[PDB]
Each structure stands twice: as structure tokens, then as C-alpha cells.
Amino acid sequence: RDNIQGITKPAIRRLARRGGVKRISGLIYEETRGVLKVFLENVIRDAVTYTEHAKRKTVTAMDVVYALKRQGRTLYGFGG
Amino acid sequence: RDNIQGITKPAIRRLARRGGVKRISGLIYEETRGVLKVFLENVIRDAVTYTEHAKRKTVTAMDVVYALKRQGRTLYGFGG
Amino acid sequence: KKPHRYRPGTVALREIRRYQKSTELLIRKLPFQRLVREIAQDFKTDLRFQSSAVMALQEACEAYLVGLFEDTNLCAIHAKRVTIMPKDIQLARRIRGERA
Amino acid sequence: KPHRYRPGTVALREIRRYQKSTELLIRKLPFQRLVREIAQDFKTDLRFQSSAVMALQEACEAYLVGLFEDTNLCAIHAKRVTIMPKDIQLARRIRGERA
Amino acid sequence: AKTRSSRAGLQFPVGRVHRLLRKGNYSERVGAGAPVYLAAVLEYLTAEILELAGNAARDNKKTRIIPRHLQLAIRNDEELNKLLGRVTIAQGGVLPNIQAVLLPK
Amino acid sequence: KTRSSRAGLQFPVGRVHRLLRKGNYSERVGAGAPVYLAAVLEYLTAEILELAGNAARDNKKTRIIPRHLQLAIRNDEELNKLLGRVTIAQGGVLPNIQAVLLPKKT
Amino acid sequence: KRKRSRKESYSIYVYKVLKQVHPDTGISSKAMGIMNSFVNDIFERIAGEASRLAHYNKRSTITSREIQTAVRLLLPGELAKHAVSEGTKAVTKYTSAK
Amino acid sequence: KRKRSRKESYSIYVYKVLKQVHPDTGISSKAMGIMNSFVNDIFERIAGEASRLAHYNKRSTITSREIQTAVRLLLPGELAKHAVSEGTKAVTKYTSAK
Ligand SMILES: [Ca+2]
Ligand SMILES: [Ca+2]
Ligand SMILES: [Ca+2]
């Protein structure tokens, strides 16, 4: 079972709503999943790189924060 | 008389022609001059601040190339 | 003897007001977590994840895609529309600079 | 009667012309007087390296060149061929230059 | 008090900053006026945001700042928005904004 | 007896090592660091000069120019990404007209 | 025992400033992680910029001057003006202090 | 009158590499102008990333490891593989030279 499907249609609507979206194509869900799947693969490829360099087997919040700042999308409240 | 208009309708056209544009609203020209002028104001603000900081009365190619690295518009082939 | 139903749109507009009012995480947390490990494995197996790290992943995913919807809605409205679509997404992402 | 082209096919030449070449497509002296006039607000009596103004112009062109590649995709999305201030205003808002 | 931060009148740590700039690989050397100057800058930007968020908490009948009160103080002040343009504020949400062409008549 | 020749590298292992020490990157610098870095900066230099030099030959020319650089880079998937926010001067754009602005039935 | 390595933060000075600007309000730890990240982000911005300034003029030393300049590069209009107003006020007050 | 001051450049090295790759292929001055900004930019990036890696592991020293890591971080896929290949080779050859 590909977990990705676990990103439910009803979650994807809730996000969109927050974005001021009122009506939505049904096709979107499959595009929102691959978009989402890209975004993570990039960030976790980075997060796991820092981790691999620190020699650990545990990915930290710092491993994510450094990956997100490399990716342009800097994040506050998990240790800047 | 304050230059801005010197960026000619023919010129603006030519740029757009490079950039895939087949047909050009008449209000574009004035818009694109607002755009280009803001873009310059900010690049030049930076380069001149680098100037002021090097204690100089002449702007350099680098003052620019540094300024455009801070605006994220890394320019190759004029130093650095 | 009235069955008073809402018109196709009005619970969309409430749902908006609501979730813009709130800050809580809108994907269900467990599915996300497992997915995150299913992505990770493709680089390194047998990986452990701080709880807070996986929150730091989600917090980013949602706020990314929240953003991506905002812009994707402005792409729809541009096209004289109110339904978002795959071609609204992909334009935002192109103009954002995410794919060639 | 004389020959005339179909309103569009010369723009299509103009496009294939200007994409093929690399020269600067703004008038260099006007660009320079503007630049100096912009600058002089930030500091009077500045001088400029000719390479500096030609760096500024190389970025100015290629940014707007790209803004029109964008602004055209914005225009085509609205099933249009004519670029419009809205298309520029969108590309700029989606680019985060504008908000 | 004997400490530099008390010399400048500044809450933020002069001494800490000055050590961090050494240990942070910026330049070979660091003047005694640099960390003072930087400490006062980081204090101000704190002080604006805490003044504005501290009022976003006084908008919700709270006496405690949360990640939302920051987000609102941030995205509604134009200048701080520009500063924090690439910045994800966790548990901040978004600003309340629905387009006009989605509303009813 | 030189370091570049000891590594087999046309780039300066030394200069790169100096540059490292002087660029305020870290307190200290390993002895592989500059060998590795130079070697990478060899290869990325080499990967463009090939493609650029193809494009130059595909313009029937001898001497590579900013155009023959831009082409090679924007027509390679990877490199394009690598220099994604990099204005190459005097290099132009690729020839590209979106197909909904072509001729009807051609 | 006595673990957790001793980790540093600005959280006490966020608290000292907070009580100046609003004595009678306080702040969540979630909110203090944003404030701490924020300080750490701008710190890193202003020092990396001042680093380059000093590098570009072949200057070894990062003076108050390099920060003044790097402030002006990073902050926008009215936020920059004040920043320099305050930071100059601190150095004038501290050179008095000896 | 005086000599002009030194302005270093990679341009001999770029030529050396260009002549391996395409022996009958020259290069303009502007083209070299670019290839120089090219390297110097990718130095600034790889060093900068390796600088942050060490600082995140509290390491004083940028070794050959912190480069390789930063190379994987910054380059695209097949670009990075060969980049990891040729740098690994480089240090291997220099250590067995002594
Ligand atoms: Ca004027
Ligand atoms: Ca004036
Ligand atoms: Ca030293």
C-alpha cells in the first residue's frame, strides 16, 4: 500500500480551503499528491544527507531545518 | 526629461519579442517602465551602498555584480 | 415540511473562513509519518526520526501547499474561473520556478 | 495592389530574429542616462564604470526577457495571445516580487 | 552592572554575540563596536515584533503570545513581511483572505 | 614535485587550498579538501566546455562564446538546474515559440 | 545524569524585552521557538553580509561599520532607519561607558 | 609608468581543460569571463556548504568529507556522481603519491 494515498482527499480540500480555494477539480488530488511527493523527496534527500554526514541513524529536527533553508523555505520554531 | 521614457516602445517590444510575446497590449509599455524602474532602484540601491562602504565616488562592475547576487540575480561575466 | 439544503458553494466558503481562522495541522498525522519513512527508505534504510523532526517536515509540507493553493487560485481566477485544476497548479509551479 | 503581411507573421519573424541573436535590445545611451538619474537620488556626483552600467543592462534585459516568457505563459493560460498588465502583475505576484 | 550589555544599556548579550562572530567563520578579526551594534539591532527587531504580536494577543483576550499572534503581526506589517518573505512560521496558519470573485453578491 | 601533479589535476590544488584558508570558511582545513574541491571544479568546468564546444562546432565555429555556453547549459537538464538563477551575459535565450502561436494547419 | 549538554538560547532576553514593551503579557514556548529562530536567522544574515563586505574590501576586521552597512542591505526602508538609529545609539552610549 | 596589479584567474586552467576536451576549440575573452565567474561561484557554494556542515557538527576543520557531502547537496544527480567519482580519485591519487 503506497502511503501517499493516505494523504486523503478530505485533507487536500482542507489545505486548499486555507488557501482561499472554493471549487476544486477531482483530478487535482492525483496532481497534489505527486507535487507533495516531489517536495518531500527533495527535503528528505537533504535531511538524510546532513544525517548521513553526522554519521547518525536518527534524523533530527535540525536535519530538517538545514534542508528547508537550503530549499528556500526557511522554518521557525524547530530551532533556527 | 527624466529618461524613463527613453526606454522606448520599440525597445520594450524587442525585449518581449525575445521573450516569446506575439501581441502586446498598449498599456504594457507604461507598466514595463514602472517594473524596470523598480528593478533598477533596488539593484542600484545595493551597488551604491557597497560603493559608499568602499569609501568611493565611482561605482564598479563588482558593486553591481555583488548587488545582483543579493537580489538573487547572479550575473556571470563582469567579474567575481 | 421543508428539507433546507445549502447551495453548491456555501460550505466551501464557510470551510475557508474556518481554516484560515485556525492553525492546527490539516493532514492526519499518522499517514504523513509513515509516508515520510517511505520516502526516507529510498535514500537510507533503518532510519529513526525525532517526533519534532517529523512535525518540522509536516509544518513545511502544509504551509508549502497552502501557499501553492493561494497562487493556484489566482491562476484559476486569472483564467476567468473558480475551479482550480492541474493546469493551474503547474503554471504556478513553472512561474515559481520548480520545473523546466 | 501591393503585398502586405498577415498581422502576426512579422511578429513571428521578430521573435525568431531576436531569440537567435544576443545583442542588447535597449538603446545604450538612454539606458545609461536613466541609470545615473536613478542613482543620483541615492548619492549625488556618483561616477560609473562603463562595465558597471553594461552589467546593470545585461541583468535588466535578461530579467524582463524572462518576465515576458512568464507573462506570455500567463497570457496563454487565460486562452489569450496578447500580454496584459494583469499577466505581468500575476507573474510578479507568483514570483513573490509583488504581494 | 559590570557587563558590556549593561554599558550599552542593552538587554541582548553583547558578550555572547562577540564570541559567536569569532566562532562563526566570518572574518579573521572583530571590533568591540560590532557586537554592541549587532546586539542593539537584534534587540530592536525583537522589540518591534513583540510590541506588534503583544497587541495581536491583546486582540484575542489572551495574555500569552502563540505562533498565530506572531504570524498576524508579521504578515499585516508590510516591512516585516518583506523581511520574512521566505519564512514558514509554524502553527501560524495564514492571513484571513478570500478573493472577491469567489464571494456571493 | 607539485601538489596538482601529485593529484593529477589541471586545477591548482594549492590556490584552492589558500583560497579555502583565506575565505573564512573554517578554522582549519584538511589536506584532501583542496584536492577534492579542485577535482570537482575541474570536472564541472570540463562538463560545460565539452557541450559548449559542441554547440560552437554546431555553429560551424572554432572559438566558444557566451552563446555557446548558454545553449549547452540550458539544453542540459542537470546543468540548467545547477545554474538555474544564473544570468549568463550575452548568451541570449533558446529558440522557443509556444505552439499555440504557430501557423494554422502547419 | 545532569545531561542535555547545556544548550544556549536568547529566551531570557526575549523575556526581558517583552516585559519592557508589554510588562503584562507573556509568551508560549512554541512562540519562543519562533522568536529564537528569528533572532538566529537575522544574526546569521547580518554576519554573513558583514563578512562579505569586509571580504570585498580586503578588510580582515568586521567593525561596527560593516554591520551598519549590512543592516542597510538586508532590512527594508523604515525598519533599516531605526535599526541603524538604535545600533549607533548603543555604540555612542558604550564608548562613553569606557 | 607602473605595472598593473595582479588579478588572478582560472583562465589558464580552463584552457588546459578545454584543450583536453576539444583540442581544436578556442574560446572568446567574454566566454572566459563567464567560465571564471562559473568556478568562483561553485567554489563559493561548495565551500559555503562545507563551512556550514562543520559548524553544524562543531568541527573546526573542513576535511575532504565536508566537501563530498556539500557536493551531493548542491549538484544534480548524474553531475554529482561523476563529481564524487573524480574528487574521490583525486585524493586517492595524492595520498598514494605522498
Ligand atoms: Ca527624479
Ligand atoms: Ca532627483
Ligand atoms: Ca585564522
Swiss-Prot record, chains A, B:
N6-propionyllysine: modified positions: K9, K22, K55, K57, K69
Modified residues (N6-(beta-hydroxybutyryl)lysine): K9, K55, K69
Substitution effect: H53R: In TEBIVANED4; results in severe early developmental defects when expressed in zebrafish embryos
Modification N6-(2-hydroxyisobutyryl)lysine occurs at: K9, K22, K37, K55, K57, K69
N6-acetyllysine modifications at: K9, K69
Residues found modified as Phosphothreonine: T58
Name of the protein in its database record: Histone H4
Organism of origin: Homo sapiens
Lineage: Eukaryota, Metazoa, Chordata, Craniata, Vertebrata
UniProtKB/Swiss-Prot annotation, chain D:
Family: Belongs to the histone H3 family.
Location of this chain's protein in the cell: Nucleus; Chromosome
Known role: Core component of nucleosome. Nucleosomes wrap and compact DNA into chromatin, limiting DNA accessibility to the cellular machineries which require DNA as a template. Histones thereby play a central role in transcription regulation, DNA repair, DNA replication and chromosomal stability. DNA accessibility is regulated via a complex set of post-translational modifications of histones, also called histone code, and nucleosome remodeling.
Any one of the GO BP annotations: telomere organization
Source organism of the structure: Homo sapiens
Residue positions, PTM N6-acetyllysine: K20, K43, K79, K86
Name of this chain's protein: Histone H3.1
One Gene Ontology term of the molecular function aspect: cadherin binding
Keywords: Acetylation, ADP-ribosylation, Chromosome, Citrullination, Disease variant, DNA-binding, Hydroxylation, Lipoprotein, Methylation, Nucleosome core, Nucleus, Phosphoprotein, Ubl conjugation
Subunit structure, interactors included: The nucleosome is a histone octamer containing two molecules each of H2A, H2B, H3 and H4 assembled in one H3-H4 heterotetramer and two H2A-H2B heterodimers. The octamer wraps approximately 147 bp of DNA. Interacts with TONSL; CHAF1A; CHAF1B; MCM2 and DNAJC9. Interacts with NASP; NASP is a histone chaperone that stabilizes and maintains a soluble pool of Histone H3-H4 dimers.
PTM-bearing positions, type N6-methyllysine: K1, K20, K28, K43, K86
Annotated positions of the N6,N6,N6-trimethyllysine modification: K20, K43
Chain positions found as N6-crotonyllysine: K20
Modification Phosphotyrosine occurs at: Y5
Modified residues (N6-succinyllysine): K20, K43, K86
N6-lactoyllysine found at: K20, K43
Presence of the UniProt keyword DNA-binding in the record: yes
Curated annotation (Swiss-Prot), chain F:
Cross-link (Glycyl lysine isopeptide (Lys-Gly) (interchain with G-Cter in ubiquitin)): K1, K105
GO CC entries: CENP-A containing nucleosome; extracellular exosome; nucleosome; nucleus
Location of N6-succinyllysine modifications: K81
N6-(2-hydroxyisobutyryl)lysine modifications at: K22, K60, K61, K81, K104
Subcellular location, principal: nucleus
Intracellular or extracellular location(s): Nucleus; Chromosome
Residue numbers of N6-glutaryllysine PTMs: K81, K104, K105
Keyword annotations: Acetylation, Chromosome, Citrullination, DNA-binding, Hydroxylation, Isopeptide bond, Methylation, Nucleosome core, Nucleus, Phosphoprotein, Ubl conjugation
Modified residues annotated as N5-methylglutamine in this record: Q90
Residues recorded with modification N6-crotonyllysine: K22, K104, K105
Molecular function in Gene Ontology: DNA binding; protein heterodimerization activity; structural constituent of chromatin
Sequence positions bearing N6-(beta-hydroxybutyryl)lysine: K22, K81, K104
Biological processes annotated in GO: chromatin organization; heterochromatin formation; negative regulation of cell population proliferation; protein localization to CENP-A containing chromatin
Modified residues (Phosphothreonine): T106
Function (record text): Core component of nucleosome. Nucleosomes wrap and compact DNA into chromatin, limiting DNA accessibility to the cellular machineries which require DNA as a template. Histones thereby play a central role in transcription regulation, DNA repair, DNA replication and chromosomal stability. DNA accessibility is regulated via a complex set of post-translational modifications of histones, also called histone code, and nucleosome remodeling.
Family of the protein in this entry: Belongs to the histone H2A family.
Official protein name in the record: Histone H2A type 1-B/E
Species, as recorded: Homo sapiens (Human)
Name of the encoding gene: H2AC4
Shown residues within the full chain: 16 to 121 of 130
Swiss-Prot record, chains G, H:
GO molecular function: DNA binding; lipopolysaccharide binding; protein heterodimerization activity; structural constituent of chromatin
Modification N6-lactoyllysine, positions: K16, K58, K81, K89, K93
Residues bearing PTM N6-glutaryllysine: K7, K16, K19, K81, K89, K93
Glycosylation sites (chain numbering): S85
Positions carrying N6-methyllysine: K19, K81
Residues modified to N6-methylated lysine: K89
Location of N6,N6,N6-trimethyllysine modifications: K58
Residues bearing PTM Dimethylated arginine: R52
Post-translational modification N6,N6-dimethyllysine, affected residues: K30
Residues recorded with modification N6-succinyllysine: K7, K89, K93
UniProt modified residues of type Phosphothreonine: T88
Coiled-coil positions: none
Subcellular location: Nucleus; Chromosome
Site of covalent link Glycyl lysine isopeptide (Lys-Gly) (interchain with G-Cter in ubiquitin): K7, K93
Residue numbers carrying N6-(beta-hydroxybutyryl)lysine: K7, K58, K89, K93
Modified residues (Phosphoserine): S9
Cysteine disulfide partners in this protein: none
Keyword Transmembrane assigned: no
Lineage: superkingdom: Eukaryota
UniProt GO cellular component terms: CENP-A containing nucleosome; cytosol; extracellular space; nucleoplasm; nucleosome; nucleus
Processing and modification events after translation: Monoubiquitination at Lys-7 (H2BK34Ub) by the MSL1/MSL2 dimer is required for histone H3 'Lys-4' (H3K4me) and 'Lys-79' (H3K79me) methylation and transcription activation at specific gene loci, such as HOXA9 and MEIS1 loci. Similarly, monoubiquitination at Lys-93 (H2BK120Ub) by the RNF20/40 complex gives a specific tag for epigenetic transcriptional activation and is also prerequisite for histone H3 'Lys-4' and 'Lys-79' methylation. It also functions cooperatively with the FACT dimer to stimulate elongation by RNA polymerase II. Phosphorylation at Ser-9 (H2BS36ph) by AMPK in response to stress promotes transcription.
Modified-residue entries (N6-malonyllysine), positions: K89
Family: Belongs to the histone H2B family.
Protein name: Histone H2B type 1-J
Gene name tied to this protein: H2BC11
Full protein stretch here: 29 to 126 of 126
